[PDB]
Write a protein that binds this ligand. Structure first.
Ligand SMILES: [Ca+2]
Length: 320
C-alpha cells in the first residue's frame, strides 16, 4: 500500500514553539514522520518558521507560513494544501486558513492551545514578579539567541516574550475573537464546534486530537497530585531514555494545580478541542505527539507515527 497516504493535496507539517524543521539542522522536529508519510505515498513539506514569535502581525509566523504555502503551490502546481500543525503550529495554521481560505483544503491540530496554556500563564506570572524587570530582558535575550542558534537557517526573527504572551489564556481569547472558526466551541465551554467550515465559498475539513498523559489523582490541602498514564509506574524505561518524560509530568503537575485538568504537560484537553475531535484519549505527553525524544515513549502510549499515517489516509478518503 504505497499510495495509502497519497492525499490529493500536499501535506504541510507546521511546528510549534521553539521549533524549526531540523534542530541545529540535525534533529527533525517531526521525528521520523516525513519519511513514513513519503514511503506510503504522501507529498509532504515541513515548514521552517520562527521558533519564537506571535502568529499574527506583519512579522508573525502566520505571514511566514502563508509565504511558504504559496511557494509550495507555485513549486508543485497544486492548488490547495493540507495543513497539519502541532502545538502553536495549529494556531499558525488557523491564521492561514482564515486569511487565504482558497489555498487550504484542511486543518488538523495536534495538541494545540486554542485557549492558551495555564503553564504559560504560570511562567508569565513568575516573570512579572521582578520589580526591576531585568529578569524579562535577560531571560528573553537568552531565549532569542537559543532561537537563532537552533533554527535551521539561523532565523534572526525571534521574540521570546511575544511568543510567551501569545500562548497565555488571556491572549489566546483575543486571538479567537480576531480569527474565529466554526470549528471552535463557545469560549469557556470545553466543547468543540463543527467538523467543517466554509470560508469565501471554500470548504475546509477541520480535525484535532490531544494527548492526556497527565491525569489529576488526589487533592489534599488544596494540593492535587497527578499521574503520568503514558508509562508503567516508576519502572518505565522512557523515564530514563527520554528526559522530557519526567519534565512534562512536572510541568503537568503545575497545570493540574492551576485547574487545567487532563493535559499533556503543557496543553489541557479543554484547550485542544477543535473541529472534528478524533480523540482526546491518547496516553501521550506533549512531545510524544510528534514522536519526540528520538521516538521514545512510555509503554502505554500509542504509536504517534501510525496515528498520523492513518490520518493521511482518512484525508485521502475524504477527498483532500
Ligand atoms: Ca517521549
Amino acid at each position: 500500500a504505497d499510495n495509502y497516504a497519497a492525499t490529493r493535496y500536499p501535506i504541510i507539517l507546521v511546528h510549534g514553539l521553539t521549533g524549526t524543521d531540523k534542530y541545529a539542522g540535525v534533529l527533525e522536529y517531526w521525528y521520523g514522520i516525513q519519511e513514513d508519510l513519503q514511503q506510503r505515498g504522501a507529498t509532504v513539506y515541513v515548514a521552517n518558521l520562527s521558533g519564537f514569535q506571535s502568529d499574527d502581525g506583519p512579522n508573525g509566523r502566520g505571514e511566514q507560513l502563508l509565504a511558504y504555502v504559496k511557494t509550495v503551490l507555485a513549486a508543485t502546481g497544486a492548488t490547495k494544501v493540507n495543513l497539519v500543525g502541532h502545538s502553536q503550529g495549529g494556531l499558525t495554521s488557523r491564521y492561514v486558513a482564515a486569511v487565504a481560505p482558497d489555498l487550504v483544503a484542511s486543518v488538523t491540530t495536534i495538541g494545540t492551545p486554542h485557549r492558551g496554556s495555564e503553564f504559560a500563564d504560570f511562567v508569565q506570572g513568575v516573570l512579572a514578579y521582578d520589580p526591576t524587570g531585568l529578569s524579562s530582558t535577560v531571560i528573553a535575550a537568552f531565549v532569542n539567541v537559543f532561537g537563532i542558534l537552533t533554527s535551521s537557517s539561523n532565523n534572526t526573527n525571534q521574540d521570546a516574550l511575544a511568543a510567551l504572551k501569545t500562548l497565555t489564556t488571556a491572549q489566546a481569547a483575543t486571538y479567537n475573537q480576531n480569527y474565529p472558526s466554526a470549528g471552535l466551541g463557545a469560549p469557556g465551554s470545553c466543547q468543540t464546534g463543527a467538523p467543517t467550515e466554509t470560508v469565501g465559498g471554500n470548504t475546509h475539513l477541520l480535525y484535532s486530537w490531544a494527548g492526556t498523559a497527565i491525569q489529576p489523582t488526589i487533592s489534599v490541602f488544596g494540593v492535587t497530585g497527578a499521574t503520568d498514564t503514558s508509562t508503567i509506574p516508576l519502572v518505565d524505561p522512557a523515564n530514563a531514555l527520554d528526559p522530557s518524560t519526567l519534565a512534562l509530568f512536572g510541568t503537568g503537575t503545575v497545570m493540574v494545580n492551576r485547574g487545567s485538568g487532563q493535559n499533556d504537560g503543557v496543553v489541557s484537553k479543554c484547550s485542544a478541542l477543535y473541529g472534528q475531535v478524533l480523540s482526546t484519549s491518547y496516553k501521550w505527553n506533549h512531545l510524544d505527539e510528534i514522536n519526540q525524544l528520538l521516538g521514545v515513549r512510555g509503554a502505554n502510549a500509542e504509536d504517534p507515527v501510525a496515528v498520523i499515517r492513518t490520518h493521511a489516509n482518512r484525508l485521502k478518503l475524504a477527498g483532500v
